[PDB]
Amino acid sequence: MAIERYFIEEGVREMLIDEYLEKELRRAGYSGIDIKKTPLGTKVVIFAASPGYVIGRGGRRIRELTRILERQFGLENPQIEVEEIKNPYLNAKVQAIRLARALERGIHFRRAAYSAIRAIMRNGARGVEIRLSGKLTGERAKSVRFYQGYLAKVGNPAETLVSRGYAQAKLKLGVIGVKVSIMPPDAKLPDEI
Amino acid sequence: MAKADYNKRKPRKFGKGARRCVRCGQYGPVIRVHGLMLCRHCFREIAPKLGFKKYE
Amino acid sequence: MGQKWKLYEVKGGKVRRKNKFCPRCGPGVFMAEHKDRWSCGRCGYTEWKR
Amino acid sequence: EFKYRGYTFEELLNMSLEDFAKLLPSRQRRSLKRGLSPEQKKLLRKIRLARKGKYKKPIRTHSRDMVILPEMVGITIHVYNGKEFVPVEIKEEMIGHYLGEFALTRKVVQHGSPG
Amino acid sequence: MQKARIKLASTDIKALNEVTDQIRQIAERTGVRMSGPIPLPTKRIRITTRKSPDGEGTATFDKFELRVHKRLVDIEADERAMRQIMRIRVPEDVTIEIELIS
Amino acid sequence: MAKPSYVKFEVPAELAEKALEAVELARDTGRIRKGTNETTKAVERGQAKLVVIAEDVDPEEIVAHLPPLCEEKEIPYIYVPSKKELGAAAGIEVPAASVAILEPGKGRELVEDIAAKVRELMK
RNA sequence: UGGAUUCAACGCCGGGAACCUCACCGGGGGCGACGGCAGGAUGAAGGCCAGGCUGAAGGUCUUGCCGGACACGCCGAGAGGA
RNA sequence: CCCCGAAACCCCCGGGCUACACGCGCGCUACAAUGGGCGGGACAAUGGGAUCCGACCCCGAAAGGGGAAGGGAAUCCCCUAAA
Ligand SMILES: [Zn+2]
C-alpha cells in the first residue's frame, strides 16, 4: 500500500458512502458525512437536517444502516452518530433537495423557488441563484433562473465561497434539474475598506 | 424440470470485461492509474469530492 | 417429477432393498443399473460392475 | 514421396508428440508445449476412435485453432466458419497447420459499381 | 541512543505544519534533539480526462490534480517522547509512520 | 400410505393434529421420517412404535399387504385427513403422505398416552 | 452493429475491438418478483452417475440414480433491456 | 413515453466489427549528399513501479530465457535518449 493509494481509497470509499446516503436520506436533508478511524472502531458522523428521519423508529434506521456500512463497505466497526447543519439555509444541496421534494409534492415552481429564495435571504445570505431546467410549462423544455442578492460565478472565490447544490426532481412526466448557488456573508478581494 | 443452470458468470482476469466502473458499471474507458477503477465520466463528476483540483 | 419411487420390497417383518451399493462410498448410497455399471446418487462418479 | 522433414508419414505416426513438435514451426510447437484445451482433447479422442471404431458420425467442431497432426489424416473434419460446418479432407501436406486456414469465413468480394 | 524517523504526509500544509509544530514544541518542552521537518518532493497525481461524453465537438481536457505534501522528522527515541508523540492528535487527513533507526 | 376407502377407525381432530403439534417440537430433538418408502422402512425395521398417515398417495402401493401385516409388531397408524393439515402440522411447507415417528419427543407421558388412545381405537 | 458530415464529422465517441468489450451474424442454453390458475412433495422443487444427440454440454433423453422438498404447464403483473 | 418482455432480458461457442474494383480526411516513411551505412564518442527531462519495477550474474546471434539484490518511491529500477 502506497500513500497516494491510501488517499485515493479513502476518498473513493467515502464518495460511495455519500452516494448511498444521498439516495436513502434525501428526505432528511443529508448534507454530508465525516469519518474517523478511532482505535476502538470507525466512527462516522452524518450531518443532516432531520436526524429524526435518519434514526426513524428508535434507532431502527441507524441500525440497518450500520449493518450496510460494515458489510457493503470495508469498515472496521461503524459507530454512526448524527448532527445538524448549523445553517442549512446557507447550505445549498439541502435546499436544492427540499425544492425538488416540493416540486414532487406538486407545488408550482415559481412559488417554491421564490419561497426558498425569501427564506435564504432572510436567513442571511448575500446572494442566491436558482436554476430550474426541464419540462416546465408544457412539453418543450426551458430553463428559468430566479435570483436575488449578489452572486459571483467565475474565479477561485466562486469555487471556494459560494455553495453549489444540485438535485433532480423526478416528476410524472420527467426530470426537473435544480441548481442552487448561495453566497453567504463573507467578503471578496476588491472590497478594500 | 431436472436440468442444470447455465448463466456462467465467467471470471475474466484481463480485458475490458475484466474491468468495470465501481459506480455506473461501464466496461471501457476506465481509470486505473493509482488504484482507481472509474469511468472517465464519473471521475470528472466526482474528482473534487476525492480531493482532485483543477489548478493548471 | 418422476414422482413415485417406492423401491423396497417388504419381505415380511423387514424390507429388502431394490438398490445396489457402491463399495468406495459410504452407507445408504443407492445405485442404478446401466447394462454394465452402477450410478451414485449422492455425488456421482465413475464405476462399473466388474 | 511426401517426406515432411526427411520423415515419411509412417515415421510421423510412430513418432511421439514431443519430436513431431520439434519438427514443427515455432508457433505450433508453442501451442502443443502449452497444451491442448478440453475441446481439443475431446475432438482428438473422437478422431482416435474414428481411425479405430467408427465414431458412428462425422466429426464436427468449432475449434479452428487445433493444429493438424499425422493422426488427423485420412479423415474429414467439418469446421465451423461462423455459419456452416465446412468439410476439410485432410491430406499429408496440411500436417502442421490449423483447421481454420481451410475453413474460411469471408467470401471473396465481387464489387458493384460505386454509388 | 537510537533515532526515530517520522514520515508524515497530507493534502493540507496547515495540518502538516500543525503536527510539526506539535513535535517541535514537545521536543523543546523536553530537550531531545530534533532534525527539522525535511520537506520531501510533493507528489502530483495528474489525471487528464476528456471533459466530453459525446465524443463530438472539439476535444477539451480536464487536468485534475491531487497534491501530497510530505515531511520527515528525525527525533531521538525516548520512551517519554515516543509515548507523547503517540498521544498526538494526528488529524484525519494525514498519515504518519514512525520508523526507528537503531 | 392411506386411501379414502382405507379409513378403518375414528380419529379425533384434536387427538391426531395435537399429537402432531407435540412431535413438532420433537423433530428438533430427533429424526422423523416421511413418505411411504421411509414409513415402510421404519415399520419394517422396527425402530418406530406408531405412525400417522394421510389419504393422498397415488396409486395403491402397500394396502394389498398392509391389512395382514400391520399386526406383525403391534404398531398403530393414526389417520390425518389430508396433505393440507399434514404439511401444516409437520412444520415444513410441502407435505407428505405419511409421518413415520422415530425418537418421539415432549415426553412419552403425552405421546404414547395418545398411543394408549389408539390402544382404545385400533392398531 | 451504431453515432457524428462545413467551420464545430472523418487517430472523434478516450473507439490501440483475437474472447469479453458488442450493441451485428450463425448456433446453443437460462430468466415471471408478487398474486392467482393446472396441480402438489406420493419424494421431489433443484442438482444429478455412463452414454446418444450436441461444436461441447445433466440441455435433453430409453435405461435407471437420491440429498429431503412447491407451482409459466396458464394469466395478469413484472426484473432487466448498449 | 413507446416497445420487448420468455424475448428486443442474461450467459456460452464460433464468426464479424480487421472484409476492398474505388472516393475523402489526418498522419508515418520517403523520393537522398542540407545524405545512407559501419565503427567509435557525447549530453536530458517529465512521469511510472506489487504479482509490479527489476539492477547484478549466467545462457543465447537476435528476439528472448533462468536465477535474482534492492525497491510500496528524493534511497532501488524503468534510465548512459535521439537529433
Ligand atoms: Zn462510472
Side-chain angles (χ1 to χ4, degrees), chain B residues 21-26 38-43:
Chain B
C21 170
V22 308
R23 229 148 151 297
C24 64
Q26 203 187 350
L38 274 179
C39 81
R40 65 186 191 76
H41 312 81
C42 262
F43 176 81

